[PDB]
């Protein structure tokens, strides 16, 4: 798809969950660089 006319990305901002941070959408692969590769496990809550 294409970005909104005159825009380079979309900011998706939660308006219900106040603790949820934003999500972002770009429409050209050239606008992101995969800078860090993070290997991890989720941890079981104590």
């Amino acid at each position: 798809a294409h970005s909104p006319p005159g825009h380079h990305s979309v900011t998706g901002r939660p308006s219900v969950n106040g603790l949820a941070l934003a999500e972002y959408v770009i429409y050209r692969g050239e606008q992101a660089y995969p800078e860090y590769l993070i290997t991890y496990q989720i941890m079981r809550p104590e």
């Binding site: 825009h7 992101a32 660089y33 860090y36 079981r44």
Partner: protein
Amino acid sequence: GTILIDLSPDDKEFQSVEEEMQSTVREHRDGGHAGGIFNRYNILKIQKVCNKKLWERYTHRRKEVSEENHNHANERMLFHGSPFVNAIIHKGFDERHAYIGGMFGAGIYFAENSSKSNQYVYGIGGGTGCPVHKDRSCYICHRQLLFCRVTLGKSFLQFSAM
């Protein structure tokens, strides 16, 4: 032409990236269905992704965007989880493989919450969980996220009921 450079946990750059991972975990309204139940990660490895051609491709576009947006690339560092992380690091992002069913249009999605991106490491909605145990909340299997430099430029503000 991608090279992965292991960062030492003693290195401030490792500790900085870990802190971004850990500090942006949140609770998810699916109760952990997609990404599992956790408050924190065990970070096993952080590698810098080095690829000259992909970097030049990014900085070239960053410059175009900057010039179209009062000299402001609006560059962020954002998470991205995907089953295709190994392809992304070698081939770069590719909008011909956008997320067709995303809430905000068919594009490439990134998150400020590391735990939101974690919901996609095993597939959409966690898919069927880790390949070995079929457990979306697997505490055993290793996961991988990307922490990406993302040019937003002029960003269309879409408010969502999430």
